[PDB]
Structure formats: structure tokens, C-alpha cells
Design a protein around this ligand. Structure first.
Ligand SMILES: CC(=O)SCC[N+](C)(C)C
Length: 286
């Protein structure tokens, strides 16, 4: 191992349901109040305090472990570009990674980016989910290239504005996601995530070096492979079934949620988010 990185007292997080700590719930509640066309309540009824899980997301745990305040801009459904898996949001707000970056910079209103804040980016799952669910055009290799370019562009734009510290999360293992398994799309997910995870860190390392950034890469796929190979070590029993099924309809939750990897058909449980946040924190001093 190398020296730990310097301590973190503020996180700005950008991404999707794997980070969102209330924004999709806040926004959809607003959109419902205003009768926006297409609006639905997200994440829905069988979730903990607006998270797309049964407890805090990984970045919430990371902030807790490091002793940092968290400003979490992530929105369930977010893609790596401007918009969301949920097309009906685009009219009201651009809630993709690029949209979240735009909005963060607009809120600063000319005032400086906190050069000590950790800018946490965790996105790309919805690029794949949207493509597969609405028969996207692009070959998966091109889709991956798009996701990678979008994330690199976000880091570039944040650094441009004054950000100096980043943590970028890899693709997760989409190939074991229960919705992917049920769509018989394991190989497509493998191909997509491998493409993202091979290319992105090469591009980020070049940007790190050009702009003098601190940029750490978290390999979520290595993380999940290690968990799922040795589950009893971590107290996990059921790696595949959702604890809280929602497809085709909501059923009763499993008795022991901390023994489950998945909460719903797309999202990990609070236990996996805890382990993930602890692993992300391992690179930093308290
Ligand atoms: C990574 C996430 O935001 S999971 C959301 C999955 N869904 C939008 C396709 C239902």
C-alpha cells in the first residue's frame, strides 16, 4: 500500500441511485405538486427515507467514516450525460451527471469551488439500463465510450472551475444485478462494464496528471467480486434475490436484510453500501 491520502471535511457527490440521499424524492414530490407531465413518486414506498435502498448509500457511509459533511447532488435514474433514465424529468430539470455539474457550478454563482472538497462521481448504470430497456441504437462498445467521455468531461469541467480532489467510482457489476439477470442480459452487462472499467481509469490518470489533481479510482467490481466470493465472512447469505421485490409487483421484504446483497432489483442493501463506503474510505486518513 501507498501513503493514505489527506483528510476530507467536505464531499460534493454526483451520480445516481447508488449515491442519492433524498434528491429524487424531493424533486419528484415537487414535480407531482406542480402536475408535471409524466411525474411519478421516486423511489417509492418500500425504501428508507428517500434512498433507493433500506439505509444510507455508500457515499453517506464514506462521509461518516472520514468525518466529512456531504452535499449529495446525486439523483436516482441519472445518466452520465445531461439527463435521466426517466425521460419525463428532462422537461423540468437535467438530472444526469452533466446536469448536476451545471447546477452545482450555477449555484456557486461565480464564487470559488472549495479546493479542499472531495468531488465524488459514481455514475453509468443508467446509461446501460436505458439502452437495454428502450432498445438503444448504439453498439455497447460505443455506449461505453460515451459513458467514459461523459465522466471524463465532468471531471474536466469540475477541475476547470477549481475542483482539485476527486474520487471516481468504476462501473458496478451490472452483470449480477437482479433486473439484468431476469432480462437474460448478463453477457451484455459484462461487455459494457468491462469496456467502461478498462478505458476510464486510463483517461482519468491522464487528466489527473495534466491538471495536477488528486484523483482516486474506486474499483467497485473488484470490491463486489471479493464480497460475493467470500460472503459468509461479511455475514451475507443471499446474493441474488432481492430482499424487497418490486417486479412485477411489491411483495413482503425478507426477514434478515443484512444477510442480503440486493434490496430491490437494481440496488444493493444498506449492508453492501456500508461495506462499500468503508472500502472507499480506506484510501484516506481520518
Ligand atoms: C443506478 C440507478 O439509479 S438504479 C435505477 C434503475 N431504474 C431507473 C432502471 C429503474
Amino acid at each position: 500500500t501507498s501513503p493514505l491520502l489527506a483528510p476530507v471535511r467536505q464531499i460534493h457527490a454526483f451520480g445516481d441511485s447508488y449515491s442519492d440521499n433524498g434528491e429524487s424524492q424531493r424533486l419528484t414530490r415537487e414535480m407531482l405538486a406542480k402536475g408535471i407531465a409524466g411525474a411519478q413518486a421516486l423511489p417509492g414506498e418500500v425504501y428508507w427515507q428517500g434512498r433507493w435502498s433500506n439505509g444510507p448509500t455508500a457515499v453517506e457511509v464514506l462521509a461518516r467514516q472520514l468525518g466529512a459533511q456531504l452535499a449529495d447532488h446525486a439523483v436516482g435514474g441519472a445518466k452520465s450525460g445531461a439527463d435521466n433514465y426517466y425521460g419525463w424529468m428532462s422537461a423540468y430539470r437535467h438530472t444526469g451527471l452533466a446536469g448536476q455539474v451545471d447546477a452545482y457550478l450555477a449555484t456557486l454563482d461565480g464564487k470559488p469551488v472549495d479546493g479542499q472538497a472531495l468531488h465524488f462521481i459514481f455514475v453509468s448504470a443508467n446509461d446501460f439500463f436505458e439502452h437495454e430497456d428502450f432498445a438503444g441504437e448504439q453498439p455497447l462498445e460505443q455506449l461505453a465510450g460515451s459513458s467514459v467521455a461523459n465522466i471524463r468531461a465532468a471531471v474536466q469541467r469540475l477541475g476547470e472551475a477549481g475542483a482539485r480532489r476527486f474520487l471516481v467510482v468504476s462501473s458496478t457489476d451490472l452483470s449480477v444485478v437482479p433486473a439484468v439477470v431476469a432480462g437474460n442480459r448478463v453477457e451484455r452487462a459484462q461487455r459494457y462494464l468491462q469496456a467502461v472499467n478498462a478505458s476510464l481509469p486510463i483517461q482519468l490518470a491522464a487528466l489527473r496528471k495534466t491538471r495536477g489533481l488528486e484523483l482516486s479510482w474506486f474499483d467497485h467490481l473488484t470490491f463486489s467480486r471479493h464480497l460475493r466470493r467470500n460472503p459468509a465472512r461479511y455475514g451475507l447469505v443471499e446474493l441474488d434475490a432481492p430482499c424487497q421485490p418490486t417486479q412485477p409487483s411489491v411483495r413482503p421484504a425478507c426477514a434478515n436484510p443484512d444477510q442480503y446483497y440486493f434490496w430491490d432489483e437494481w440496488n444493493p442493501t444498506r449492508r453492501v453500501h456500508q461495506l462499500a463506503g468503508e472500502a472507499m474510505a480506506a484510501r484516506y486518513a481520518r
